[PDB]
Design a protein around this ligand. Structure first.
Ligand SMILES: Nc1ncnc2c1ncn2[C@@H]1O[C@H](COP(=O)(O)O)[C@@H](O)[C@H]1O
Ligand SMILES: [Mg+2]
Length: 606
């Protein structure tokens, strides 16, 4: 069987991502190369053509706002016409253009080249960085992963996330629903009875609520509901609009035309929002904000709440849907688990606690890391070789699937909250061509819901004496993703042909070209780490030799007047050179380490 290596759990978030591994009976949430247990979901290309991912990308946003990409999870697996896309791209500083009926990200990548990236490619870069983070920690290559998606992600969003994994060079062994991952983190340890858990997951971009039963390592989602375009970024945009209006009224200046000013505001609005979760006012200040003038304003918690009042209130509707679909009531809920960074907001915690008549949420759950933690547990389990415990997940599809057969019945096929994997088959006795449209959602007329895809059965040969009998199977797999297959039942032959979605999913050929492009940048990442790692070595040697030559008792007291002049000099000579050659290639740094060795060694061995 396949050696899957160390399987990592990656929470791929709208604003932050987080990677974990299960080793020696516990989860390690892995710190990145800057020491942060979460990594911004940001990519950028510097004017010189270098790809930054994570903190470095976020840190240069104000200086380079058109070639910095973030919030790709709000675009991934969506079509251009999607009204959520059309709303969102108005507030994103990078260009988004239509390609293959989809929103592509267009940025300048250096060398005078403009490149268009699929959202899957941007998310792939973020997953690469998470993978790079895990590899540095484990001191070995990572080939396999569990990656998270919102419970309410549709089929295309699900598939596009898995594709992002493939592009990043990861075999995604499992797509796991964010609230299900969170439930594992709550429930793993627990030596207790059967519990009804409500997970309320409000992140940077998406909202999910899932109701689970948990009993001795058995986790079952009874019902899920959410909103894939509601999160922290939305609250910021509400505050941004307020202050753009305030500044215009106060000064006459409409700053919307100036990306740099807008991104400086957004940066400070984000910090202020966070501050308002622990204080009742926050100051927003920007030195030379616009045309040389200072921005200085205060935001109150009351005002923050008022600006977002409808959005915060709307989070209760999913809670009510899951309770109704589960056939439970409020008092049946044993624990409330808050996850996602936005659950820090006091008004959100208050709405949830009030809804549950004063009940305290479950304590000790880090809302930014719980999802990755659970993912890492499932990944530990899929590894085989871990001290995890027994873990049995039964999750559900979020959306009712229905079909529209042209010249046939329109019909509901698989209700929302059906345990996956699941399937349903339909016989078509029409012959000729059969075109089937699949829809996702809860509106009673099937075709008023979201179009998942169009599927054509093309080749039906003649059956002299028998009936045209094509059986189409609609299967939702353990990743929550639909496969449509067709088999001829009148013949005897058992040929389960996969019917391909005409709503342009990435083909294996297209995916592989994106892989090749990603691998080119990964090569550069490899060189750079290697080059910096040696420059660091040479610089560490040198500055540590400065505190040994500067050890007048030990090594210093040994050296003569002739020796230490041909030593203190060699050290300073090297530091001097280092200070003017930070950009030098991996060759040169080896040389100068060796030059500083062949001049130090003869002396130190006397
Ligand atoms: N203290 C806070 N108050 C309000 N929102 C926060 C806070 N900390 C993080 N967030 C939001 O949580 C989102 C990130 O969630 P996550 O990816 O789970 O860390 C972003 O929208 C953050 O602004
Ligand atoms: Mg996030």
């Amino acid at each position: 069987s396949e050696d899957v290596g160390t399987v990592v759990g990656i929470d791929l978030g709208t604003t932050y991502s987080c990677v974990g591994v299960f080793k020696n009976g516990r989860v390690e949430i892995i710190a990145n190369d800057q020491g942060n247990r979460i990594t911004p979901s940001y990519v950028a290309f510097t004017p010189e053509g270098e790809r930054l991912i994570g903190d470095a990308a976020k840190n240069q946003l104000t200086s380079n706002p058109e070639n910095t990409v973030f919030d790709a999870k709000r675009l991934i697996g969506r079509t251009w016409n999607d009204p959520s896309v059309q709303q969102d791209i108005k507030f994103l500083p990078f260009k988004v253009v239509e390609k293959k009926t989809k929103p592509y990200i267009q940025v300048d990548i250096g060398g005078g080249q403009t490149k268009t990236f699929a959202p899957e490619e941007i998310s792939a870069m973020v997953l690469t960085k998470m993978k790079e983070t895990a590899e540095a920690y484990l001191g070995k290559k990572v080939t396999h992963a569990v990656v998270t998606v919102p419970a309410y992600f549709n089929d295309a969003q699900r598939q596009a996330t898995k594709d992002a994994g493939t592009i990043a060079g990861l075999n995604v062994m499992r797509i796991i629903n964010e609230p299900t991952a969170a439930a594992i983190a709550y429930g793993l340890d627990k030596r207790e009875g059967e519990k009804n858990i409500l997970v309320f997951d409000l992140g940077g971009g998406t909202f999910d609520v899932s109701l689970l039963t948990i009993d001795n390592g058995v986790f079952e989602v009874v019902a899920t509901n959410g909103d894939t375009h509601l999160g922290g970024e939305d609250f910021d945009q509400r505050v941004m609009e307020h202050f753009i209006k305030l500044y215009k009224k106060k000064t006459g200046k409409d700053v919307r035309k100036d990306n740099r000013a807008v991104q400086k505001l957004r940066r400070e609005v984000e910090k202020a929002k966070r501050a308002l979760s622990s204080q009742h006012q926050a100051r927003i200040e920007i030195e030379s904000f616009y045309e040389g003038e200072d921005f200085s304003e205060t935001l109150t918690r009351a005002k923050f709440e008022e600006l977002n009042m409808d959005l915060f209130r709307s989070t209760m509707k999913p809670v009510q849907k899951v309770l109704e679909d589960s056939d439970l009531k409020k008092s049946d809920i044993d624990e409330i688990v808050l996850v996602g960074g936005s659950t820090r907001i006091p008004k959100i915690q208050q709405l949830v606690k009030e809804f549950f008549n004063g009940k305290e949420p479950s304590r000790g759950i880090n809302p930014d890391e719980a999802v990755a933690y659970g993912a890492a547990v499932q990944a530990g389990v899929l590894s085989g070789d871990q001290d995890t415990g027994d873990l049995v997940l039964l999750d559900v599809c979020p959306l009712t699937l229905g079909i529209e057969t042209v010249g046939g019945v329109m019909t509901k096929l698989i209700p929302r909250n059906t345990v996956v994997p699941t399937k349903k088959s339909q016989i078509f006795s029409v012959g000729g061509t059969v075109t089937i449209k699949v829809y996702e959602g809860e509106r009673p007329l099937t075709k008023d819901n979201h179009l998942l895809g169009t599927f054509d059965l093309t080749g039906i040969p003649p059956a002299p004496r028998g009936v045209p009998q094509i059986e189409v199977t609609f299967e939702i797999d353990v990743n929550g993703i639909l496969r449509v297959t067709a088999e001829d039942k009148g013949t005897g032959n058992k040929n389960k042909i996969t019917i391909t979605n005409d709503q342009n999913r990435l083909t294996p050929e297209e995916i592989e070209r994106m892989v090749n492009d990603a691998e080119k940048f990964a090569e550069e990442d490899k060189k750079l780490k290697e080059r910096i790692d040696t420059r660091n070595e040479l610089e560490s040697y040198a500055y540590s030799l400065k505190n040994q030559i500067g050890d007048k008792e030990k090594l210093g007291g040994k050296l003569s007047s002739e020796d230490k002049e041909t030593m203190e000099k060699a050290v300073e000579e090297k530091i001097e050179w280092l200070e003017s050659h930070q950009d030098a290639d991996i060759e040169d740094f080896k040389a100068k380490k060796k030059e500083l060795e062949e001049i130090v060694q003869p002396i130190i061995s006397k």
